[PDB]
DNA sequence: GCCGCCCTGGAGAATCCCGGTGCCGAGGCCGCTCAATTGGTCGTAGACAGCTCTAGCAACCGCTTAAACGCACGTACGCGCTGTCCCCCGCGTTTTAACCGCCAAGGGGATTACTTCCTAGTCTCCAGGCACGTGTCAGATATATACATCC
C-alpha cells in the first residue's frame, strides 16, 4: 500500500522530508511553496504505474 | 748695622639650626528659626472585578504583478600628480586702549513688614453646544428618442 501523510505546517512537513532522507525512503512532498508545474510533475510521478 | 720682603698662627664676624611666640584657614560650638516631622482625620484615586466588542497574531493558502536582482557594457567622475601664484603666517616695531584704581550723585532693584480689595476658586443649577444619526433635496451624470444629413 501507499500512504498520504497530511499537516498543517510545512515545517513539520519538512521535519517528516528530513526524517526520510536519513531514513532512505522515496518520498515526495507537496505544499504552498510549490509551483504548479512542479506539482503537475510530482502527481504524475507518484500516479505513475 | 739698618731696612725691606716672605711664611705662618689665633681671634673677630657671617651663617645654620632650634625654640618661643604671633597670625591665616578651618572646624567645633552656640543661638536663632523656619521648615520638616508626627499624629490624627477624611475623601477619593486607583486597584480590582466583570461584561462587550474589536484589533492583533501565528501559521498556512492562492493569485498577480511590479519590484528586486543579476549581468554586461560603457563612460563619467573620483582621485592622484604637477605647476603656480598668492595669500596667510611669522616676526619686528610702534601705537593704543584694556585694565585697574578713582571720584560724584542719583536711581533701580532686592529684601522686610504692612494694609487692602479684587479676582479667581468653589459650589449649585441649568441649558445649549457638540456629537451622532437620519429624511430630504438640488446638482451632476448617463441614456432614450426625434430631426438633419451623406452616400
Known sequence: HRVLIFSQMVRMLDILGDYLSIKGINFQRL???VPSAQRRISIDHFNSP
Request: charged share 35%; glycine share 34%; no cysteine.
Open 31 to 33: 505544499d504552498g511553496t
